[PDB]
Symmetry: C3
Subunit: 155 residues, 3 copies
């Protein structure tokens, strides 16, 4: 038997003006599409499909979903945000998880290094599509060690 | 058969003066109590109870426990710390996991965005109570996308 | 049946000069060796061995691997990087996961608090050895609440 829990803050639609939530179903950030999915020892797929930057569910159930995104830049603040999204039978793409950083404000800032990891438990249906979207994609580093995206089914 | 490991730094009682450990069983931070636990597609409980801001264990075993807490503020540094605590048959609440950030020190800092994720594996007993506690709770953002708390049993 | 996926950025060998990748099989950072592995309620091993700072695999399969490393210091920027490495039947130690932060650049910075968590899914073989390595080890805090390393097999 599966024994698990995922509970969230009660604010369903946040009124925050800093990183505005979208009200017309528009995706925030730019979807990451340059993922590698079949290098033995580094990446794999087992009964999960990959296409168009999305992991597509074959088996309904509870999944732990996670992503790390590595922001690296050389030189005002940058808003560095990672979104994990779900498409399902619903008119809008759904933000499952959001994680945000601001770069250092000091005028002495020569460069930045901001790895953002997050993950959590979500009930998914067959043919749901999940993907990662980030602000400031031009600052993302697609180093296979530093940026990745995965999920596993919990039995 | 369950195959797993969780090993920790050897310092049992840290002598650090920056974020002092408590010596009289007093909880650090303020417990988060405004969690939502039953919105299909966003939150759920399966053989785990929720009450008084705590996840309460029904089935003894090994759990992966995690929480994300989103600090957002508009304007000295702020100590932003997330504690995951356990109550069991022990005279004190027990810190299982601690994760800390300091806000940017620059006088030019207009705002802050600090999402803190952590998680790990802990052996739990029936009726153990686990909760999340944070410093600077007034800066926490209970956006359901950004702040959450969960666990799952490992078979 | 195990249902899971882990996909990575396509850049196999990153050309970044900021945190240079190693080209002669040399390990980056210093391996953490002062882990505690058998304090009931805080740490444990179940069909995983510990020796020489490494978790050593007894059972081939898919593992979710994670580590948190807590950097704390009192006082230019510091590069704070966590590497999770694998030794297997391969001439070089293999970086599985890298996560990086830079400390605040402000000259007003009195102290720093930088907890770094990361984790992910990797297929491991029997007798593979996995460990954590960090830059600026003298700034690591081996508080058992704040710094840890674990993994579990996914069935
Ligand atoms: Cl920006
Ligand atoms: Cl880049
Ligand atoms: Cl403070
Ligand atoms: Cl707030
Ligand atoms: Cl450095
Ligand atoms: Cl900063
Ligand atoms: Cl230290
Ligand atoms: Zn700063």
């Amino acid at each position: 038997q599966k024994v698990a829990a995922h509970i969230t803050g009660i604010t369903r639609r946040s009124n925050s003006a800093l990183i505005p939530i979208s009200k017309d179903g528009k995706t925030l950030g730019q979807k990451i599409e340059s993922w590698e999915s079949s290098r033995k020892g580094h990446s794999f797929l087992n009964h999960v499909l990959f296409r168009n930057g999305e992991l597509v569910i074959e088996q309904e159930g509870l999944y732990y979903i996670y992503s790390q995104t590595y922001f690296r830049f050389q030189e005002r603040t940058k808003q560095l945000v990672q979104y994990i999204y779900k498409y399902t039978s619903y008119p809008d793409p759904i933000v499952l998880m959001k994680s945000a950083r601001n770069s250092c404000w000091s005028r002495d800032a020569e460069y930045g290094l901001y790895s953002i990891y997050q993950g959590g438990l979500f009930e998914l249906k067959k043919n749901d599509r999940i993907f990662v979207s980030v602000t400031n994609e031009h600052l993302m580093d697609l180093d296979q060690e530093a940026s990745f995206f995965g999920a596993f089914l919990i039995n």
